[PDB]
Design a binder for this molecule. Structure first.
Ligand SMILES: [K+]
Ligand SMILES: [K+]
Ligand SMILES: [K+]
Ligand SMILES: [K+]
Ligand SMILES: [Mg+2]
Ligand SMILES: [Mg+2]
Ligand SMILES: [Mg+2]
Ligand SMILES: [Mg+2]
Lengths: 497, 497, 497, 497
C-alpha cells in the first residue's frame, strides 16, 4: 500500500522531435495486445496488424460463440503462416461476473435527480422510472446504506438508502436516460459472484486449453484465492498457461500485492476501474500497479481508451498520445487496443501510431538511470540467477551490445533479464513452444524456437546467425549470451566473418 | 536542443487512491486558464467557474468583435466582485497569422489519393477538385518540392511537386472531403506573415491595454524578433503586460531557447503543433519545453485537448485524465481549457474535474526530490536574490511551514521562489495591481494587494492575519517571510494568539 | 554502536601541492589546544604560541600545585593583553583516578615472560620480581581470571590467574624491566574509583571556578553518571563551564552515546585509550567518535601523539603529518599538543607546523559534499533554529559569502551553524564573557565581545566594521547575518563604502 | 593536476573496536613490502616474516655488494621452500642518482644561521664552516638565485645567492651541525644526473635479470623518458620485469600522469619527497597519487616511516597506526617497511602489527560504495574485458561469493578485477612463473601456478579443490570464475560435495 513511483528519466533532443523515425515498427520494445473483432477478421488485415506491431491477439469472450472465436483463431493461424518470424501470443479474456439491470416496460426510462429508485432482485419484473430489476441476487446483502451504485457505464449514480431481502431503495443522484440490460458497478463493495462461471469454465477447458492459448486474462479478480481457483482449474493440462488477473475494482486494489504474488502478470482494466474508483484516481492506480509489477519482475498490460478517439478518427488526440507515451515511460510491458482494433474504422492506423509512439517514448528513456533505480529499489539478497541476469544487462549497456541472448526452457532466465530493462533486445531461445509464445508479454523480449537436446554453443552460434539474417546484429557487434540458469554463465561474443 | 527531462518523483499510497479528497478546489497549486465563450457568458456561470478553480480568463481574439469581448469582460468583472478574494488574470490570445483555402464552386470537393492538386494565390478563384486557392500569397516562395502541405485540420496531406510564381502543384497523399475556407499548415516551413497584423495591433492597443489585460498569448511565434516586436509595440504604456508566446510550429521549436529568453512565459499550443510535427512527437516537445521553462523559472501553460471528450460527455476518458495529471507531474504551471469551457455542454464539470486531477497529481509529488533535481540542474553561480529565495523553499520544507510570504513590488521575489516549487502556498504581497494579477501564471502563487509606503513588519503581520482568516494558516504553524529582494532577508515566524 | 564514518570528500590539485600557503596561521578553522608547561612559561613564548595558532590553553592538573598553575595562568593573561583580538579558552584537565604500582626493594625489577607475579593491595609492601603492590584496593574484586593487566605504559602485560581478597596472582606475558610507581591499566574492566577525588574537587571549586576556566576535561569518564556528578558539583556557580569527558577506556566506549548526550564535547585521549583497547583499534574509535560528535553537533578534541616526534626533532614524521591531516579530514574540531608544547624543545615549531597542516587539510575539503553528507545523515524533523542555521550555511556557500555573523547570548546559534561546517568563518557576537571564550572549542568559530542591551542592527554593523578592520571581509563581499534564535532571521548584507 | 580524492566510505561498529580479530594475517588484502637487512637475514626470521604477512621482499641496492644481496636472496629461497603456498615477489630498489656533500677538515662543522656558505664542485676540497664541496658537478647550472638547498636530511636549509661556474654561494637559513658526505636535496630543481648509472646498470643486468627479480623500484624518476630508458635497458630479456618508479621530488609530481602512463605501478617515497616539497604537503601528494593510481588500475606502494617508532619500540605511536590505516583507506595496494625490518629491533612485531592494522582498516571499508565511486569516476567507453571484470566484482558482492577465480597468462584479467576492489579474494591462476610473482603488488590478489596447455574447466575445478584445501572456500559457497580475457566469460559455481 505504498509505492515510490519514479518515471524513467527521459532525455529529449531536438533531433528526436524533428527527425523522422525510419525503423521497423516490430523493432519496438513495448508489445501491443490487439483485440480481434469484425474490423480485423480478414487474414489480409491480420497480416497488416502483424506488420504494424501486433504481438498478442486478445479473444474477448464477453461476446461471441466458440465457433466465432475458432474461425478468428484459424484466420490468425493463416496470418501467422505468412509471417513465420513474428510469433504471436494468444490471450483469452474471460467474460467473468457481470451485473446488469433488467428490462423496461417502455424500453427507456428517464431517471430524475433527487427522486428515488427501487432495485429488485426479481430479474423478471418489467421496470419503470421507479423500480428496476438487478441481475445480482445478493445485491441487498452486499451494499449498505450510503453505498453508491453506478448504472449504464456510470451515467447514473444512486445512493443506497434502505436494504431489504429482495430489493434495495436508492436516491437518484443525477438525471439521465437509460435503456435495458445496462451494466452496473458497486464501488467499494466486494462482488459475491463466481470468478469463473460454468460459461467461463467451458471457455477455458474447451477453448483455451485445446486451442493452445497462452494467457488467460481473468476479468474482475478480487483476491489471491480467485487466482488459485483458476490455477487449480487449469490443472496439469493447462499448467503452462499464464494467468493475468484484470484489476477492475477496489477489492483488486486492496489485495493487489497478494493477487500479484499468485499471478503471472497484471492487466489494468482502466475503463472498468474508473467506474469503481473516481476517474481522477485511475492514473494513481496505473502508476502504482506498474511500479509494483516492475519491482517484482511481473509483466503488466495497460488497457482501455489509450487511442479511443481513433475508433472514428484516423489521428488521435494530444491526450491519447501522451497516454500511450506516458504508459511506456511509466514502465508498462504492453499497451492494449480494444475497440480501436475490434470494431473501429482505422485498426491498422491505430496499431501503427501506437507502435510509433512506443518507439518515440522508448528512445528518450535514460537506461543507465532506469537500471540504477531498479537496482536501488530491490531487496539486497538476490539469487545467483538474478545476479547473473543483472550482470548481462549491465555488461550489455557498458559495451553497447546489440543483443542479450538468453537460453531458457521455462522462460525464467529471459524474465529475470527483462526485469532489469536493457536498452537492447533480449533474444530468448527455447525448445518449448509454450515458452516461445508466453514470453511475448514481457517488454523487449523476442523469441526463437530451437530444437531440444542441443549443445549450448551450437544453439548460441545458430542464434547469432539467425540474428544476422534478421538484421538484429551485424559484424563487429558484441552480444551477451547467458545460460545455465550449478553453473550460471555470462559470455560476451563478438560477431565476425 | 537537449533536455534531460525528469518527472517529479511520485509517491502513491493506497490511501490516496481510496480516500476522497475533501479540500477546496482553489487550494490547488496548478492554475487553470479558461477560455471564455457562449457556454459561460453568464455571471452565474463565471462565479461557478471561479469556485471550480478558474484562475486566468482567456479571451480568444481569433473570433468575436471588441464589443463581444467587452461584454464578456464586464461580466467577468461582476463575477470578480462577488469573489473578491479570487483575483483573476486576464489573457488576450491574438488571432495572429492564418493560412486558409479559398471558396469552392460546389461548396465541397472530394480529393482523391494519388491525384494532383493546384494551389493558386489568386484568392478569388472558385476552386474544384483540381485547383484550389490559398490565402498565403508567398506560398510558392515558401515551400519547395518535397514539402508537405496540410489542409483542414490535417485531414488532407499534399506533397509539393512544382512551384511557380502564382501557384504550386501538389500530389494528394490521401483521400478526403473538404469544404471552403479551411485552415492550412506548412510543416517545416517558416511562415512569412506578420506576427502582428493591423487587426492584432488594434486588439492589443485598443483592447488589451485599455481593458487592463495582464497577458498577451501571441499566436504562432517563430522567433525572438517576433517577441521583441510585440514588446516594442506594447511600449511604456503596456510595459507591465506579460508576453506569452504560443509555440505552434517547427520554427518555434528550433528557436525555442531564444524565444524563451525574450518571453515572460510559454504556451504549448499542442493542437496546432500536432499539425506541424508528427502527432507522436508532440509529447516530446511538451516535456522538453516544460523542463526548459522549469529550469529558467519561466511559467508554462499546457494547452489543447486535455479534457476534449468533455465537450460532450460529463466525464473524461482514461487518457485525458493521465494527460492532465502527467502535465502536472511534467512540471507545468498552468493547464488550459478551450472548447471545454467556451462552447461545450459541461464547462463547470470540466474545470471541476481538472482541479481534482491537479490536486491528486500534486499530492503525490516528492518535493524534497523535486527540489534536489532543480538545484542540481541549475548553474552554480546564482544571485543573492535567488539563493535567499532558494533558502525560503528549503527552510519551509524542513520545518513544514504552511506558507512562504513574499513581499514583492515587481513579482520578481515570488517568481524566484516559485522556480523552486515549494510544497506550501506562496503568498505574494504587492502594492502593484499589475503584479497581483500577473503572478497567477505561476504554479502555487496566490496574491494579496496591499497599500504602498508601508512598513515591512506591518505588512507581514497584516498578511498573517488575513491568512488566518482565509484558513491558509493556523495558530502553531510556522510561516516563512522573505523581503528586501542591499539586504535580502528570510525570517521564520510562529503564528500565535 | 554503529557509525557510517565518511571522510570529507577531498579535492587535491597540483597547485596546492606546489604553491606555498601564505595566509595567517590564525585564519585556520581547526583550533589548537596547547598544554602549558616549562617549555612555554615565558610570556614571550606564549605570545609566540598565540601567533602560531594556539586557541585553547590546557592546564594539566595531573602535576603541579595551584601556585604553579596560577603563575602560568597569570602569564597567559599578560600574553592575552598583548594579543587582545585572540581570545583564548582556558581548559583544566583533571588528574582524576590513577592506578600505580608500589615501591621496589632495589628500585628495579626484571619481570620474566612465563613467570608469575603477585599483585598485593598493601601499598606499603616493598616489591620484588615475584610480588608488587598496587594502589587500587579493589583490584581483586574488579579483575577476573583471564583479564589482562598492563603495567608501565603497557610495557608489561600480565594475565590474571587467581584472585583473593587482598591480592591477585598473574602470569607475566612478556619480559621487561620496570621501576617504581608505574601506571597500570585494566583493559575491559570498569575502574571503581571516584571520578572526582577531593584533590579534583579542590582543583575545580578553588581553581577552575575562581580563575574563570571555560572547560573541564574530565579524565577517565566511564559513564553518563560521572558527567552528571561533575555537573552537579559545578552547581549554579560553575554552570557556564563546559564539561569535556576524556574517553580513555572500554567503559567510555561502551557508554559513549550516553556520555556524549550529557556532555558539552569530547576529548579522545588516544594514548591512554591505546592501553585499554589494542593499538590497532584506536583509529577505529577515533573515527567513530568524531563521526558521532559531528552528527550531534558536539565538539571533539583529538589528543595525544599527533606530533610526538617533535618533542625532540624540529620536523615531524610522515605518519604524524597524515595523522594531524586525517584528524582534520575525519572532522575533528580541535587537535591537541601535550609534551610537544609543555616540555619539548620545539614548542613554537610544533604549533606552527600543526597550523600549517590544518590549513592544507581544510583547503582540500569539498564543502558542498560535506554539507550534503551531514544533511542526509541527520534526523528529518529538525527545529526552526537548526533549519535557519542550516540555511545560513547553504546560502553562504551558494553566494560565496566571506562570513556568517551569528548574534548569540548562549552560543547556541553559533554551535548550530558550526554543526553544518561552512567553508567561511563563523563570527559569533556575544555579550557573554563566558560564551565568547567557550565557543573556541568549535571548528571555524571566532568570537567578538559586544555590549549588552544593543539593537541588533547596530551590533551587526559594528561587527561588519570590525571584520573589515581585521581583513576578515572587504568591500564587495557578501556576509550572512543570523539572529533571533518567535522570529529566527537570516539576512544577506553586501559590504559597501 | 586535479584529483577528487575520496576516501573509502567506512562503517565502524562497536563490535569491531571491542572484539579481537582472530583471522590469519596472510588473509589480508593489503600487501606488505619488507626491506631485507641484517635484522632479518636468518631463514628463521624470514619464515617468521612470511607468517606475519610479508608479501614482497625489497633489496635496497643503495648499499651492499652483489654477494651480500645474493646471500640474502638465497636465504629467501630457503624460507620460500618452507612456505611453498606463500609465493613472494622480489623487488630491486635502485641506488639511482645521489647528491652528497664532501669531506670536512675537522670531521664536523657548525653552520650558523645568517652566515654564508660556498658550495664548490671540486669534490676534493676539504671543507670548513665557510665552504663545502658538492658531488653534483652541474649544481651551479641547475640552481638559480632564490632556490633552496637542503643538506643532511633537511637539517640545514640554504638560500642560493650567487651562481658561478664551479661553485655557488648561499645563505645559511638555520643553525645546525653537520658531518661529512651528507645527502643533499634541490627542491623544485630538476636533477641532471643519469637515472641509471653504470652501477645501476650492473645491478639490473647482472642481478635483477639473472636472479629473477619481479620489480625494479627505480629511485628518483623525474620523467616518462626515464621510464622508457629503463624499459629499453631491460630489453626482451627483462620484458616481464615490472618497473615501479619512485616519486621523490617535484619533477616526479609535475610529470606524474605521464610517468604513470609508462609505468607498471608507483612507489611513494614519502621520506625523500618530504625533503623536496614542504612536509605538510606530503599527505596531499600521497592521496592524489593513490587516487590517480586507483583510477588507472595501476598498483601503488606507500613507503617510508609508517611504523618508524617501531625501529626501537615494540609498539607504535597513535599517529603511525592511523598512518598505516589511512593509507589503506586511501586506497593503497601495498604498504612498506624499511628500517623497521632491515635493521630495527622488532622486525617480526612490525610486520605483525602492520598486518593487523590492515585487517582492521579493510574490515571497515564499505565495498558497495567503494565500487560505485570507482564506476562513476571511470571514462564511459570501457573495453569488453574491463566490463566482464567489472561484472565479476559486482556479481561477487551481490551473491557474497567467497572468491573470484581469474585464469590469466599475462595477469591482465586479474589486474582488471583488482582495479574494482572486490571484498573477496581474487585467486589468479597462471602458467607463467613471472605473472604468479608479479601480481603480488596488487591489493587482494593471491596466485597459484598451474600447468600450461590445460582445459579451462579442469584448471578451475583444480583451483576450487586447492581453495577448499586452503580454507579459502567451503561447501555451499559461491565462487566467480572469469577467463577468455573473442569470448570473455563470467561463470558462477557453487561448491558442493
Ligand atoms: K472480457
Ligand atoms: K487565437
Ligand atoms: K590529566
Ligand atoms: K634505494
Ligand atoms: Mg469488467
Ligand atoms: Mg495556430
Ligand atoms: Mg588517563
Ligand atoms: Mg631518494
Amino acid at each position: 500500500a505504498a509505492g515510490a513511483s519514479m518515471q524513467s528519466a527521459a532525455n529529449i533532443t531536438l533531433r528526436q522531435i524533428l527527425e523522422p523515425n525510419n525503423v521497423n515498427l516490430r523493432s519496438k520494445k513495448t508489445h501491443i495486445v490487439c483485440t480481434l473483432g469484425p474490423a480485423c477478421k480478414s487474414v489480409e488485415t491480420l497480416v497488416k496488424l502483424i506488420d504494424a506491431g501486433m504481438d498478442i491477439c486478445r479473444f474477448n469472450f464477453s461476446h461471441g460463440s466458440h465457433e466465432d472465436h475458432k474461425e478468428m483463431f484459424n484466420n490468425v493461424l493463416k496470418a501467422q503462416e505468412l509471417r513465420p518470424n513474428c510469433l504471436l501470443g494468444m490471450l483469452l479474456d474471460t467474460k467473468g461476473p457481470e451485473i446488469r439491470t433488467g428490462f423496461l416496460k417502455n424500453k427507456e426510462v428517464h431517471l430524475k435527480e433527487g427522486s428515488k429508485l427501487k432495485l429488485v432482485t426479481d430479474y423478471e419484473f418489467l421496470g419503470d422510472e421507479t423500480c428496476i430489476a438487478c441481475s445480482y441476487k445478493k445485491l441487498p446483502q452486499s451494499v449498505k446504506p450510503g453505498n453508491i451504485i453506478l448504472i449504464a457505464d456510470g451515467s447514473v449514480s444512486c445512493k443506497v438508502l434502505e436494504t431489504h431481502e429482495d430489493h434495495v431503495i436508492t436516491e437518484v443522484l443525477n438525471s439521465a436516460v437509460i435503456g435495458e440490460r445496462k451494466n452496473m458497478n458497486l464501488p467499494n463493495v466486494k462482488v459475491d459472484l463466481p470468478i469463473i462461471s460454468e460459461k467461463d469454465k467451458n471457455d477455458i477447458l474447451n477453448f483455451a486449453i485445446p486451442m493452445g492459448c497462452n494467457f488467460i486474462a481473468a476479468s474482475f479478480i478480487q483476491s489471491a484465492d480467485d487466482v488459485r481457483l483458476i490455477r487449480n482449474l487449469l490443472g496439469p493440462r493447462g499448467r503452462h498457461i499464464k494467468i493475468i488477473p484484470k484489476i477492475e475494482n477496489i477489492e483488486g486494489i486492496i489485495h493487489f500485492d497478494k493477487i500479484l504474488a499468485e499471478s503471472d502478470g497484471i492487466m489494468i482494466a482502466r475503463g472498468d476501474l474508473g467506474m469503481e474508483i473516481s476517474p481522477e484516481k485511475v492514473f494513481l492506480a496505473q502508476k502504482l500497479m506498474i511500479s509494483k509489477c516492475n519491482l517484482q519482475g511481473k509483466p503488466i498490460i495497460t488497457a482501455t481508451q489509450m487511442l479511443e478517439s481513433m475508433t472514428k478518427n484516423p489521428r488521435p488526440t494530444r491526450a491519447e498520445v501522451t497516454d500511450v507515451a506516458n504508459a511506456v515511460l511509466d514502465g508498462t510491458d504492453c499497451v492494449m487496443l480494444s475497440g480501436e482494433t475490434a470494431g473501429g474504422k482505422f485498426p491498422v492506423e491505430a496499431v501503427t501510431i501506437m507502435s510509433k509512439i512506443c518507439l518515440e517514448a522508448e528512445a528518450c528513456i535514460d537506461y543507465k538511470l532506469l537500471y540504477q533505480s531498479l537496482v536501488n529499489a530491490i531487496e539486497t539478497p538476490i539469487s545467483v540467477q538474478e545476479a547473473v541476469a543483472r550482470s548481462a544487462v549491465e555488461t550489455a549497456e557498458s559495451i553497447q551490445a546489440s543483443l542479450i541472448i538468453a537460453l531458457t526452457e521455462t522462460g525464467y532466465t529471459a524474465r529475470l533479464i527483462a526485469k532489469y530493462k536493457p536498452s537492447c533486445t533480449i533474444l530468448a531461445l527455447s525448445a518449448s513452444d509454450s515458452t516461445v509464445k508466453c514470453l511475448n508479454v514481457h517488454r523487449g523480449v523476442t523469441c526463437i524456437k530451437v530444437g531440444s537436446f542441443q549443445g549450448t554453443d551450437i544453439v548460441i552460434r545458430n542464434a547469432i546467425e539467425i540474428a544476422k539474417q534478421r538484421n538484429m546484429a551485424k559484424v563487429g557487434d558484441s552480444v551477451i549470451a547467458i545460460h545455465g540458469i550449478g553453473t550460471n554463465l555470462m559470455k560476451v561474443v563478438q560477431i565476425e566473418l
